[PDB]
Design a protein around this nucleic acid. Sequence first.
DNA 1: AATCAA
Length: 218
Amino acid sequence: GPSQNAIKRFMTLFSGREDVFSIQYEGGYRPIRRPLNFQDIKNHFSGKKTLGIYLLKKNDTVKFAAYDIDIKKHYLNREDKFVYEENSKKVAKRLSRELNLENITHYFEFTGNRGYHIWIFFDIPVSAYKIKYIMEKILDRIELEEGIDVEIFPKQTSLNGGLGNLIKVPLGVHKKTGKKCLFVDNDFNVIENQIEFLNNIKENKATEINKLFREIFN
DNA sequence: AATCAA
Ligand SMILES: Nc1nc2c(ncn2[C@@H]2O[C@H](COP(=O)(O)OP(=O)(O)OP(=O)(O)O)[C@@H](O)[C@H]2O)c(=O)[nH]1
Ligand SMILES: Nc1ncnc2c1ncn2[C@H]1C[C@H](O)[C@@H](COP(=O)(O)NP(=O)(O)OP(=O)(O)O)O1
Ligand SMILES: Nc1ncnc2c1ncn2[C@H]1C[C@H](O)[C@@H](COP(=O)(O)NP(=O)(O)OP(=O)(O)O)O1
Ligand SMILES: [Co+2]
Ligand SMILES: [Co+2]
Ligand SMILES: [Co+2]
């Protein structure tokens, strides 16, 4: 059925480090040094465990990347948090328009707390520095707003013997809030059938990202 | 019970 298919698709889409992943706990993240398996993602989908995925594989390539749009410390102010939520959506729209201009299929996720991830998937892994370079150049073309931060994952071009950086992956529970981390549409509305949306996510052509990298400069 | 990174 669609739901077990989505388990195998999740594995193929959020494939990062071959033999290490992470789990979100209250107060941080903990590396689990073993390959991810089916049960780990059933724990993810059920709310039992929440998974993060190290982007960089051992040869310093990634099969996916993501923008991380954050509403920074609102704290008190005048409960104007709405303006900053509005600002987070404007910034994501701006990033997303540039991605479609460059013909890069991408997907929005509500993160369960203060923002949105923009996910880009590839059919074959590409060099971490290439897509990082692309995503910095696109960030540089757009206006930003007060209270908003934009982070680019991968955060490093190369492991240097380490693990690199991880990102919490969708369809699970943000421990900080109890909310589901869910895909939304082009106007930030929650998809009703999260499973079917996942089963229809399209991968970009690695052969077209590589050409774009060179064209973006040379 | 809690790491690793920029
Ligand atoms: N690897 C790693 N990344 C972290 C850690 N803490 C924060 N980050 C990441 O670094 C980003 C910026 O760090 P901070 O500005 O200190 O965290 P923040 O919670 O966004 O800060 P404010 O919202 O401004 O209070 C966060 O949004 C995370 O992506 C950590 O302990 N390890
Ligand atoms: N202590 C840690 N150790 C390792 N990785 C960590 C980490 N804290 C965060 N990360 C990693 C995991 C995170 O997924 C990623 C982004 O950090 P956020 O922006 O702070 N958290 P998210 O975007 O997922 O949801 P929201 O912002 O709405 O609260 O950095
Ligand atoms: N004076 C106004 N007139 C019309 N809509 C208005 C408005 N003030 C606010 N709105 C609101 C009501 C509308 O729901 C909303 C539309 O704003 P986006 O979704 O950000 N722009 P688009 O529709 O083109 O989306 P996309 O690019 O993906 O195709 O703005
Ligand atoms: Co962040
Ligand atoms: Co975030
Ligand atoms: Co619209």
